[PDB]
């Protein structure tokens, strides 16, 4: 599967579920590797240029 798409879907689902969350409760994503999948690509493409 694709890490970036799965992470985006999970984040969207969490955002959806934030509305129904009781007061005094807070969501978080302390650890995620999807964000690093993009920056590296940029560097390579940048290098290509």
């Amino acid at each position: 599967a694709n890490a970036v798409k799965t992470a985006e879907g999970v984040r969207a689902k969490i955002e959806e579920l934030k509305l129904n969350l009781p007061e005094g409760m807070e969501f978080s994503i302390p650890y995620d590797t999807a964000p690093f999948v993009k920056i590296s690509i940029e560097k390579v493409i940048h290098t290509l240029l």
Binding site: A1, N2, A3, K5, T6, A7, G9, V10, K13, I14, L17, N20, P22, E23, G24, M25, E26, F27, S28, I29, P30, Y31, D32, T33, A34
Partner: protein, 148 residues
């Protein structure tokens, strides 16, 4: 609720015997601990289709399903395909300390876990919390005092 040796002698060997013969199998391994659960992993050659491998493993395990003990058969054998590492961690915390850890775990299990599993690309969601339950802590001295 059995020691690792019990499961190793009773279950693991029989499962691995048949599991050893799947197509495009790079290797296999087994682990048994004090938790009472035994996990047998099968690693296949790179480029192999996961779906075909899982169905082949299911065929081979159902071939050897009969001989296992009765209790484990009632519990059932779980076959799944998953990655070796965590993609992400989703957590719930109370900034004001209003809700305790048990309440947070119950809310995570009841609602969020199933919704996250619903999302596409989520192969497995491992929860580090347990849902609420009724617990009766019995004092043996009081029980014997009344003859119960």
């Amino acid at each position: 609720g059995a020691t690792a040796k019990t499961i190793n002698d009773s279950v693991v060997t029989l499962i691995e015997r048949e599991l050893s013969g799947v197509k495009n199998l790079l290797y296999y391994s087994a682990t048994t601990d004090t938790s009472g659960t035994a996990e047998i992993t099968a690693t296949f050659k790179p480029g192999t289709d996961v779906e075909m491998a899982q169905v082949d493993v299911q065929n081979k395990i159902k071939a050897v399903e009969a001989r296992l003990p009765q209790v484990v058969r009632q519990q059932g054998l779980q076959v799944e395909a998953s990655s070796s590492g965590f993609l992400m961690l989703v957590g719930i915390n109370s900034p004001n300390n209003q809700y305790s850890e048990v309440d947070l775990s119950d809310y995570l299990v009841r609602n969020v876990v199933e919704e996250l599993k619903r999302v596409e690309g989520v192969g497995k969601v491992q929860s580090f919390g347990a849902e609420k339950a009724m617990r009766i802590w019995v004092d043996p001295n009081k029980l014997v005092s009344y003859g119960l």
